[model samples]
Target: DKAAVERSKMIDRNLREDGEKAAREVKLLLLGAGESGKSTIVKQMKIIHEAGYSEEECKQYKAVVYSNTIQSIIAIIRAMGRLKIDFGDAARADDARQLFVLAGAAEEGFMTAELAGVIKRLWKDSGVQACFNRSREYQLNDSAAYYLNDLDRIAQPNYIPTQQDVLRTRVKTTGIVETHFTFKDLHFKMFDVVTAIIFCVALSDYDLVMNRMHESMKLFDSICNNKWFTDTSIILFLNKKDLFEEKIKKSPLTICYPEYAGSNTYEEAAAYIQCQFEDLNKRKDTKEIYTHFTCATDTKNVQFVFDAVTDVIIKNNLKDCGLF
Candidate 1:
């Protein structure tokens, strides 16, 4: 009887210890629209905290990257044709024609210098330039230009994308993704929502069809008000700041939100956009929202942002545990 009593005590002690450990774990949900940098953030965490991707894993992305390059250029060309836009260099029109023919070859797993050269030239053509000028009218990946510019290097037979190249590559988010990790004895669970709720500065057909900014704000408001997250720490990532800065030079803030009467300068426009989300969290009992301007493709930038975020999570957890 004494032996059985000792065994029961041991089992109870183990269960209690397990419960205590679980209580210290933290969960983070990375919510955002498609291409709003959620996946990139996850990749950055893998790089910084998990020692990065293997070469074999990097190799798998080559085809997707190449496919994105061809499709994006083709999209611009087709948009130009549909809009009846002409190339500034008339001879470059033939370059666009050649690209269309080569696109079929791309599907057959062939990429040649001749095709690459034609694409490079057609990308610079005036008609494609016009398409870019009106990029808001179409759905396009922000990394299209980034990859397409390096066609020569990427076309090598044994080429593998660098960490930055993989980070900049776009893969459409179709469903929910979850990742779990541990940092400093604190378990972390990160969730990527399919219909996510974060805002980005990328221009696309979705934004053109509806007021992207307003929709983003509305989505954020709904997320913030959800009862499930009442006790959760809120971290807002204003992703694609690099592209946003460049875009503001050409596209004014007022183009999307007439209420944004701020100057066309990048800083002013970014600050105003930040305030749009800040002002929404005026409800009672809301925790302070920590906001960061991030360019997810830049490893250094994401590393810093995540470091700050980890500090916040640690502090918040301590406070909740009465250890602060």
Candidate 2:
């Protein structure tokens, strides 16, 4: 009986150690409104942590990327008419007409070679550029300009999309995508599992009709104020800094937050948006909200941000384990 009891105690000790093993994996709620760069962040993690895209995988993206090129220009063409911008050349209207037919057609698996030649000339038009520059007035994907610039090379036969091309290519995620990874045995799982939430917002979306920031703010308030994830660590990614920099130079932050009186400088505008969400935490729990300005498409920048993020996660996990 003594030996049996001693063995049972050893088993119980093992269970306790397992329960207290640092911290559990984090199910990240990297949620945000439309076009807030959440998918790009997931893609970056694949490239940064995982094996990244293989050549065959890149080939898969070729169709999507080609389709992306066409889709971007089409949005620009439509926006041109809406905004009353003329094509830089008279002949380019024919180019626009040709691309218009492809709109209702396939997403890919079509004649991209001939289409690329048309887009090659279409993108060169200064008016098209003007429409794209003002694209936020309508709805255009952030990576449109980046991918559209490489039309010639992307159209070539046997061209597999490069890493950057894949990064910039927008795949409209129609469903929930969860990325799970382990950090120091901490499970960064997703969805129903317990999570440290990372609320993503687009800094450039300040001027949208739907008030994208407010949608995020309201969404963040609901999540943050909820009692379930209350004790969880919160990280906020102010994404699309590249677009925000260009946008702030043109549109003022006053479009969203009319109370702002600061000059239209990038840093000032960016910081103003930062506090808008940061101050949304209404709970009595004194959990400090973590924030970072991230351009998810930039490999180096995402790497840096994620490095800091993982450390924060680890710190928080250990804090729960009484090791911090």
Candidate 3:
């Protein structure tokens, strides 16, 4: 009777401890290299769970988007010049040169109508198109066309970027970013840890157009093998799937990843990419890695992905505490 009583007390204590642990706050670290869409996911969390961005905050991205547009265009033009490509319009050669100079001075002030027309024409040039075709040969962002195409509107006075525009804007990540919030009954402390721990690679960047994919995989391999996170749950967001669909039409996955010998369809390419990452899981590791095809800029997509992620985390936490 004494032994049975002691065993019952021990069981009660264990249950109490498990309950307390389940009630404790959980953490989700968003880790990735620059431009992998970690911040976009964070923004979506704010938009969905917390108060969305203020009008003033949205307006702040206007200058960044503008600068990014100008710089991207200039970079393309410069790349064309370096590649010895001709614009094909000899008459507008001087205009193209002038536009280049003006873009270089974009930090000084707004562009004039004449300059804007020149830029638009140059942007439409065959050489520029060729440069775009060979964009992977150089360092060019996939978002260049997203902002640059609306040059006319952006060049206007008192231009404020829309929420979507701000969402699509690019800004280099310099340091760590952290946020704390609650979803459902669970509290989350998010940290920008391990450059590719909870990896978010732009699926659209799978083509050699950007070096992000290669670097992302390399970082992911290192993080996945790290002993410190062996027991930690991993959530991988293969972001920018929207762009991936568009990019696949022009750039085949085989060009970037030679091992991908499948048909050049979006489904096949995406599946191949997913498998590459999934294969990294160690056979001995019991924790499962959750992967999602995500477009970070799409609020609806983010909402669904995050909802699934929240459920996974809650379930895992419950299992950890022997309550599931």
Candidate 4:
């Protein structure tokens, strides 16, 4: 009688486990060139669904952010000199002088109020503004201006990285990072590694070598028909749309794609850019190219986009299993 009771409970446990694993067929991999916001999306998932980051976890980013802020300002300073722009104020050159020497090593242990002030002053200089306007001409991280504007707050030792701050901070690659969560009663795994490759194209700062745009396209072209990636879904994320929208307003879309005859509206440019990549598929692929324009770092944006994308991928996957 005891054995029968235990057997009944055993069947219930197996049934639950089987039901969960049966639906565990979805895994996503992110792929993009440098600054493509791939890892940012990874961070967004953890923040959105995994109960957010602990303060101690964010503490690790302190040095990285300090260094990022320093390097970003330094880059603009160097670009100003390279492009022959003068400091807006003659006194700000001394601020630049203080930082130029720190270029020997760019981390946070040696952080100083003087150092943070120097970047703050330099960022305020018209010279830096002039150089930033020409950011598309040079290689600068998209976050340079955002962080530079917050120098005083970020300089404090007590500073706790906000979700937005952590999102903007760089995540240098280590081993593959895996973030798994259950939503809508389905188990899903998101990784920097891939099965359904989410190829991100930064529609911002178009034509990067400072040409990164063409490079992403070249990589996409190679992967599109490659025997390996064939029949594999290319979930295209035209990410950094917020920045893309901003950049488009200032820089003509024509700068990157001279053939762009369409109006310079964000809708038109984004559509054209999406088509540019989707058109690369020479394969009459069925399970191919799903496109979404995402601002991956924005919590609301990532939450909505990922939810919709999971539905798409899960549905297609279920169909493949003949179980939908």
Give per-residue CA lDDT, model 4, range 270-291, as digits (tens). Answer: 8888888888888754546788
Say which prediction, candidate 2 or candidate 3, comes out ahead on TM-score. Answer: 2
- For each candidate in the order shown, give its overall lDDT on alpha carbons: 0.70, 0.76, 0.73, 0.75
RMSD of each: 7.4, 6.5, 6.4, 6.5
Overlapping backbone residue pairs in candidate 3 total: 0
Per-residue lDDT over 95-173 for candidate 3, one digit per residue giving the tens place of the 0 to 100 score: 7688767776655435567767877787787778778777767877667887778888877777777767777877777
Candidate 4: regions farther than 4 A off: 1-23, 102-110, 207-210, 284-288, 319-324
Clashing pairs in 4: 29-194, 208-211, 208-212, 209-212
State the lDDT of candidate 1 residue by residue for 48-132, as single tens digits: 7787777877877777777778778888888887778888788988888798777765544346688778887887776677786
lDDT tens digits, residue span 1-324, model 2: 432342233222244555445444456777777677787888787787776787778877877887777777888989999999999997999988888766556545444677887888889999999888787688786778787787777878878788888888777677677777654455565531144777788888787654677888998888777788776778888998988898889888898899999999998899888888878888636768889998988999998998778777655543342210
In model 2, the Cα lDDT at residue 121 comes to 86
Ranking the candidates on TM-score from highest down gives: 2, 4, 1, 3
Q: Is candidate 1 or candidate 4 better by lDDT?
A: 4
CA shift of 148, model 3, Å: 1.7
- Model 1 residue 231 lDDT score: 69
Query: Best by lDDT, which number?
Result: 2
Total backbone clashes of model 4? 4
Task: Give Cα distance to truth, residue 176, candidate 2, Å.
Answer: 3.2
Error of 1 at 62 (Å): 0.5
